[PDB]
Design a protein around this nucleic acid. Structure first.
Ligand SMILES: [Mg+2]
Ligand SMILES: [Mg+2]
Ligand SMILES: [Mg+2]
Ligand SMILES: [Zn+2]
Ligand SMILES: [Zn+2]
Ligand SMILES: [Zn+2]
Lengths: 286, 41, 97, 111, 299, 130, 243, 111, 56
RNA sequence: UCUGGUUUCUCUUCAGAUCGCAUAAAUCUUUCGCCUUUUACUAAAGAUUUCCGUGGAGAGGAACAACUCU
RNA sequence: GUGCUCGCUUCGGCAGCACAUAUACUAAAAUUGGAACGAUACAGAGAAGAUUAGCAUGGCCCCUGCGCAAGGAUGACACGCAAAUUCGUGAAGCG
RNA sequence: CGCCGCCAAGGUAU
């Protein structure tokens, strides 16, 4: 039912080698979600690494901008649930077999035969990105995804091969922390990790820190851009720009709006292509 | 790209569907061939 | 004619392919630029030419996947405007006729 | 190993297909297992031609056991090639070979 | 304008300019020969198809009517530049054809050389080899003198050899390279022959009835060969004033045939350069490389 | 054809409304792919070179327009001075001597290419896991 | 080719050889009954319109369905195909016509008129502007891009057949026995002739289900619902002038 | 699909006849809001055939002329097929072609 | 360039497989049913080369 | 004195010769004979294929290729 | 690793030449969802009286069968929607 | 002058 020429293949599954050899089939395995006969391709990424043939088909990868074999996004290198939780639009897809699954899957394959270049619904909302998901976007990822799965007979001590067993050895797995939408167990801990980062400890008073020491101005930040980026938060009382240290001083009437600026600018407010420097003001008349 | 059951999705090598009469007899010049049709009254 | 001829040749070499066809000569490479992530991903991956061969399908295999699925027919081509003549209504008596 | 594994895949477990290629039910079959387990011409005719070559190879391995000579095997597989239908039941699911049985049964007299 | 051309899916190994300066020919690892408009919008027209091996060398005859193509499949094809139809297949060598040249002036002749160590003279009308010169080491580059009396062959013995068509004898040997010779080319006068070699030496040799007898007329430097082991070819400018030779270091080197100063070093290529050609009338340089793109440098 | 036509850049602010991935050129949703006819031998040679020692040259056409460098593990290229896997090296270091028995006459003593080499608390945790 | 094709409601399309008067191919694969069929004038393909929803392409020398044309919601009455683009014209019982693409299999254009369903289309064969046929306000069309050229007069009977001559005369055969002549230059009804019944038939049984000219187009002949073929010739008079 | 064999002759001709009269009365009735009460003209056609089989003259009042005379010509076409099959299988069971109990016990009532 | 091998290969393979009542070889047994289609192509070529009684 | 090649293994299309000194089955369209409906059928003709094999031709090797036809 | 060549000065050391990167990687799996059949208990069997030959239509139901034969209880599932006749409400318009 | 050599679905429901 499905033929292909080349799969999606994000970089963490290609391997460390730009020179890999790959064999192909015409009708290979079924997808583990919808059982569609795609074309499984097989290659060797590394010398200590398993083959990682193919998990899903091309069509289900073209719905949500997903790679081919490890089920992560191509645009970041993240799972699907983090992506549509950060963008707050799920682009729903059924769960059963013959109820509504293959119906809308065949129709979305039928309407996407022209382009084959972009996903069906994420083309308009993958543009307003790089704000909340750029904070965890791992460059040069760990190659432990590519290492082979654990073998038996070393857990029981029966392995006659010894060192020439190609899979792994001396790796005790843990039965406490290991599909398409939900639910994923370590991903909940990853959302707890991004919800429990390392900010500055909030001093115990009643919102008196309305000043803020922001610097790194140079020639990109100007006064009108900064006061219009503060104007969407609210109104000023006394603002200034100092150029001997390349810094700006802003305050607010009732602190809370600038408080989310404190949520916005903990090495996080990225305007004009620069990681700005932010530390605390005095708020003490010192 | 996903045709019907006749194309690839079946090994039903069915009866009555065989390469029988795999050559077409053409109407030659002694019959009412279209070359003699294009000029007769 | 050549379009339907190559279509029916693929059909005959797909519906009845049983009699002695060679597979392919897969000596071609494919060169695909990693233009999605690479700035330090696999340092030096700039256009990444790879090798593509084909696995031999042995002729001792039944069809592996159950072709028995049946779904209702989906939405067709979208309806064009209908543009008939102005619709008339006759009487109260000819409708009774 | 294929004619028994067809039965093992189709979840029967009551047709005792034996090495001399026959077929026997065992359990006095009810309606839901009689109609599931009956074969057409493709299974049965292959079973009879495999029984024929089974008897031929049994004749040859009986010769190479070392208790029977060449003339006796000659008359033996002459009787095998001349008296099918009497001992193989291959005409039952394909009648066209019956004339060929007669084509054997005539030429034997010529011999 | 610089002009950037693309099309070749694999490495380009050679390119030439039509004798009248109206069109270009290019070919390489793909097995396709592309024709290009020199002027206009630099358009691409016919693709010549039929080579099963890679195209090692293109040449035009002096009339610009016949295009010759040496391939790794042991066959040298003759192409009609006007229609794009194939004329003949010179089937002969037992191994790869490394290079071919077509005699100008005198009745049509073609020379080939291959990894079987032989050099063969072909008459396009016979469908059979005319002469065979067994060397003993693989032959990489071959050219005729303008009198059509001599064959000049460069191999991997670091020694350019000259063959007499009438005597069928090793007439001359040239010493002066420390490594394999990858490309030979005669001046338009017949006066001088230009050589590239792994040793990174570009050497001009003068061939004359009266020769000094130690014909290392000139030496130039800058052209680098490396681990890729690409055949390297060099060309004479239309008036013999400039010498171009490609290199593996991404630079087009053009020298002054007299003072030996580097006139041009040009970048723009990403990979190794396999051939540099000069337009027959105007100061235009076609640079062909392994990055599958061509440039039209103008001086 | 003219080099100036393809060399002429696009007047614009690069359109940063899209991201870096989606604004990049492609034809498949993942990279611009096109077939070619590269030689097999040098391809597999530099593949085995990167598989053994981790350095190889960098194949492209139009990334920087000047590229002759090595990729992967950098220092091991100049440590071995750019050798290949098909070339006899300058030294024979860390070589590993086996034993041979190729008379093919003895019983249970013939060990040729099928020979084994001369050299030839976790269980409590693995019990507590299972 | 020296053979003919036939088809009917027995779910069978028979290829009747004429050198031996026998069936040689016996096309099958239609899930319902068969209404009409047509041949391509140049190449060895055939088009067939059936009862369920589809028209299908039968390849001669292969007898395999190359394309199934599935875009209708009712039966398809008649089908014509030619050498010039567009190829296939299918008029169906869901009150629409559509012109197909024979290569890709998808439709080119759909044509929505005719409150009562279309049952007759025909090629002329000299120049463009093919015609359609329906019980209500019989129309006229065009080969490129679609174009409503003209509608004809009040031929309000339920019709079955259209046949057209190269010199400009056209004939429409209906279900009430009334067959009507037209012209190609204007759209003028000329004769308005009705056929009487041969003795066995009753008063209202006559319905024209087939009509065709000669290859000289000097003789017309119709097959009616009274199990009779009626053959018309010309009239060598002069006093039949147009008002 | 499946072909029409000798058993699905009378179970296919009636289906094609009701489909033909269906798409004929769907394309002959005028622009009123109701077509046929979804089965009634079929019932009049069937009752006209049953009344022709008993030769009841079938004079129903208050009925439009085109639907009733198209029902008359349709039951006349079914009568022509019925009698032309009756003559044919009567000649076949006369000369001895078929020995079918269904055909003979049907042809008794069909004469 | 493929040629003969020792004939004790097929015997070892089938004495390993046997009557296919084990769970180790379950990936291969369907292939045995895939050998169902071409069995008369083997039985025909078998019975074409039967040893004559002057042979051993 | 020069000229200088039989077997075996792989693709390559054409076949009109008892392609094979012999001869299998199936499909369609008809006539029959058993027959209740059908698949299994009977046995004659007409026309197609399938299948076990075969004929001559382009190349690449290897097998004593150097014995030697020329 | 192996063979050949004194090729470079010891049979030994070195150098060159030739051979040139397989594997649904497992004997396992913490294992994975487990549909058929059989057993338990229900419900029960077409055609306006009874016993019932059947052939059909549909698609998100299958099985036996080589099936464009056939048979599976007519193989099973097929049910109340009245439409225009009377009256009320609301809307569009006309005198 | 010497035809002819028989299986199954059709029934113990799903
Ligand atoms: Mg029945
Ligand atoms: Mg039934
Ligand atoms: Mg039923
Ligand atoms: Zn999928
Ligand atoms: Zn992946
Ligand atoms: Zn292990």
């Amino acid at each position: 039912w499905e033929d292909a020429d080349f799969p999606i293949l994000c970089q963490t599954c290609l391997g460390e080698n730009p020179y890999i050899r790959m064999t192909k089939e015409k009708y290979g395995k079924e997808c583990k979600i919808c059982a569609r006969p795609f074309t499984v391709f097989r290659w060797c990424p590394g010398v200590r690494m398993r083959f990682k043939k193919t998990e899903v088909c091309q069509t289900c990868s073209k719905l949500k901008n997903v790679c081919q074999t490890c089920l992560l996004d191509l645009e970041y290198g993240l799972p699907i649930q983090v992506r549509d939780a950060g963008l707050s639009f799920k682009d729903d897809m059924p769960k059963s077999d013959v109820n509504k699954e293959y119906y809308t899957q065949n129709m979305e394959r039928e309407i996407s035969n022209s382009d084959g270049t972009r996903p069906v619904g994420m083309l308009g909302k993958a543009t307003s990105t790089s704000d909340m998901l750029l904070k965890l976007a791992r460059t040069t990822p760990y190659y432990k995804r590519n290492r082979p799965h654990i073998c038996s007979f070393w857990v029981k001590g029966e392995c006659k091969r010894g060192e020439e067993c190609p899979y792994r050895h001396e790796k005790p797995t843990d039965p406490d922390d290991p599909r398409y939408y939900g639910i994923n167990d370590p991903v909940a801990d990853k959302l707890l990790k991004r919800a429990s980062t390392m900010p500055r400890l909030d001093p115990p008073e009643d919102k008196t820190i309305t000043t803020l020491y922001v610097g790194g101005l140079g020639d990109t930040i100007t006064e009108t851009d900064l006061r219009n980026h503060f104007y969407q938060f609210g109104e000023i009382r006394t603002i200034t720009v100092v150029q001997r240290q390349q810094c700006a001083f802003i305050q607010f009437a009732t602190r809370q709006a600038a408080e989310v600026a404190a949520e916005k600018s903990f090495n996080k407010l990225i305007v004009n292509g620069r990681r700005l420097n932010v530390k605390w003001g005095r708020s003490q008349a010192a | 790209k996903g045709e019907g059951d006749l194309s690839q999705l079946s090994k039903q090598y069915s009866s009555r569907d065989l390469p029988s009469h795999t050559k077409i007899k053409y109407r030659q010049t002694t019959q009412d061939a279209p070359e003699e049709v294009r000029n007769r009254d | 004619r050549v379009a339907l001829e190559k279509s029916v040749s693929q059909k005959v070499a797909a519906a009845m392919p049983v009699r002695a066809a060679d597979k392919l000569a897969p000596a071609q490479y494919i060169r695909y630029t990693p233009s999605q992530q690479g700035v330090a991903f696999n340092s030096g991956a700039k256009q990444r030419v790879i090798r593509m061969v084909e696995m031999q399908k042995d002729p001792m295999e039944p069809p592996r996947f159950k072709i028995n699925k049946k779904i209702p027919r989906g939405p067709p081509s979208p309806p064009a405007p209908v543009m008939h003549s102005p619709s008339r209504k006759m009487t109260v008596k000819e409708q009774q006729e | 190993n294929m004619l028994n594994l067809l039965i093992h895949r189709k979840n029967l477990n009551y047709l005792h297909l034996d090495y001399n290629f026959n077929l026997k039910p065992v359990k006095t079959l009810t309606t839901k297992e009689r109609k599931k387990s009956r074969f057409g011409n493709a299974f049965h005719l292959c079973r009879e031609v495999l029984r024929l070559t089974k008897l031929v190879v049994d004749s040859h391995v009986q010769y190479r056991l070392g208790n029977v000579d060449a003339f006796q095997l000659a008359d033996g597989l002459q009787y095998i090639f001349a008296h099918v239908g009497q001992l193989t039941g291959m005409y039952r699911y394909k009648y066209k070979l019956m004339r060929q049985i007669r084509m054997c049964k005539d030429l034997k007299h010529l011999i | 304008p610089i002009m950037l051309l693309s099309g070749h899916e694999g490495e380009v190994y050679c390119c030439k300019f039509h004798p009248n300066g109206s069109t270009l020919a290019s070919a390489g690892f793909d097995r396709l020969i592309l024709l290009w408009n020199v002027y206009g919008d630099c358009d691409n027209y016919a693709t010549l198809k039929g080579h099963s091996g890679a195209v090692m060398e293109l040449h035009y005859n002096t009339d610009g009517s016949m295009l010759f193509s040496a391939s790794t499949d042991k066959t040298v094809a003759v192409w009609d530049s006007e229609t794009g139809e194939r004329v003949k297949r010179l089937k002969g060598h037992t191994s790869f054809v490394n290079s071919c040249y077509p005699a100008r002036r005198g009745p049509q002749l073609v020379c080939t050389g291959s990894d079987d160590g032989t050099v063969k003279l072909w008459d396009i009308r016979k469908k059979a080899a005319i002469q065979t010169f067994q060397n003993t080491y693989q032959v990489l580059a071959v050219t005729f003198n303008d009198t059509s009396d001599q064959i000049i062959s460069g191999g991997i013995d670091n020694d350019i050899k000259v063959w007499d068509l009438r005597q069928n004898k090793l007439t001359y040997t040239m010493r002066g390279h420390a490594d394999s010779v990858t490309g030979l080319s005669l001046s338009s006068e017949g006066s001088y022959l230009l050589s590239n070699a792994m040793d990174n030496t570009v050497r001009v040799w003068d061939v004359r009835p009266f020769a000094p007898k130690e014909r290392c007329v000139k030496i130039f430097q800058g052209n680098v060969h490396n681990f890729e082991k690409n055949l390297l070819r060099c060309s004479w400018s239309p008036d013999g004033s400039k010498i171009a030779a490609g290199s593996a270091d991404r630079f087009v080197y053009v020298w002054d045939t007299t003072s030996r100063r580097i006139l041009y070093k040009l970048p723009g290529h990403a990979g190794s350069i396999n051939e540099v050609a000069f337009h027959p009338d105007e100061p235009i340089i076609i640079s062909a490389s392994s990055d599958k793109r061509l440039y039209m440098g103008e001086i | 054809p003219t080099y100036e036509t393809m060399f002429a850049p696009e007047f614009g602010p690069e359109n940063p409304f899209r991201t870096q991935q989606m604004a990049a050129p492609r034809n498949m949703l993942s990279g611009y792919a096109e077939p070619a006819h590269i030689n097999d031998f040098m391809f597999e040679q530099q593949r085995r070179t990167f598989a053994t020692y981790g350095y190889a040259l960098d194949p492209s056409l139009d990334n920087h327009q000047v590229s002759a460098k090595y990729i992967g593990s950098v220092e091991e290229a100049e440590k071995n001075q750019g050798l290949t896997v098909f070339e006899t090296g300058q030294k024979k270091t860390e070589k590993r001597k086996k034993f041979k028995e190729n008379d093919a006459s003895n019983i249970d003593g013939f060990l040729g290419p099928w020979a084994k080499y001369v050299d030839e608390e976790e269980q409590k945790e693995l019990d507590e896991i299972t | 080719s020296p053979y003919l094709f036939s088809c009917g409601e027995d779910k069978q399309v028979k290829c009747w050889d004429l050198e031996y008067n026998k069936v040689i191919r016996h096309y099958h694969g239609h899930l319902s009954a068969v209404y009409g069929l047509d041949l391509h004038p140049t190449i060895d393909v055939l088009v067939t319109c059936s009862r369920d929803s589809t028209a299908r392409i039968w390849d001669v020398r292969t007898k395999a369905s190359v394309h199934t044309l599935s875009g209708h919601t009712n039966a398809v009455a008649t089908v014509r195909c030619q050498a010039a683009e567009p190829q296939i014209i299918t008029g169906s019982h869901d009150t629409t016509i559509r012109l197909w693409d024979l290569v890709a299999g998808k439709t080119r254009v759909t044509l929505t008129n005719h409150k009562k369903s279309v049952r007759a289309v025909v090629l002329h064969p000299r120049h463009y502007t093919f015609a359609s046929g329906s019980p209500d306000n019989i129309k006229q069309w065009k080969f490129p891009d679609g174009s409503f050229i003209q509608n004809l007069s009040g031929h309000n009977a339920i019709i079955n057949t259209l046949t057209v001559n190269s010199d400009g005369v056209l004939v429409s055969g209906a279900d009430n026995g009334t067959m009507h002549l037209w012209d190609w230059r204007t759209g003028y009804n000329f004769q308005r002739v009705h056929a009487a019944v041969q003795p066995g038939s009753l008063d209202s049984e006559s319905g024209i289900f087939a009509c065709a000219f000669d290859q000289s187009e000097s003789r017309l002949l119709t097959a009616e619902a009274d199990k009779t073929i009626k053959v018309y010739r010309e009239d060598d008079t002069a006093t039949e002038e147009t008002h | 699909a499946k072909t029409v064999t000798k058993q699905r002759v009378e179970s296919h001709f009636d289906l094609e006849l009701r489909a033909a009269v269906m798409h004929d009365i769907l394309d002959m009735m005028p622009e009123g809001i109701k077509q046929n009460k979804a089965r009634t003209i079929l019932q009049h056609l069937s009752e006209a055939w049953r009344c022709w089989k008993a030769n009841i003259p079938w004079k129903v009042p208050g009925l439009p002329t085109p639907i009733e005379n198209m029902i008359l010509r349709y039951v006349k076409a079914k009568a022509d097929w019925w009698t032309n099959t009756a003559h044919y299988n009567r000649e076949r069971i006369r000369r001895g072609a078929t020995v079918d109990k269904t055909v003979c016990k049907k042809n008794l009532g069909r004469l | 360039q493929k040629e003969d091998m020792p004939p004790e290969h097929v015997r070892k393979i089938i004495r390993d497989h046997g009557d296919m009542t084990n769970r180790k070889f379950r990936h291969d047994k369907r292939v045995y049913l895939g050998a169902l289609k071409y069995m008369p192509h083997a039985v025909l070529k078998l019975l074409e080369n039967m040893p004559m009684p002057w042979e051993q």
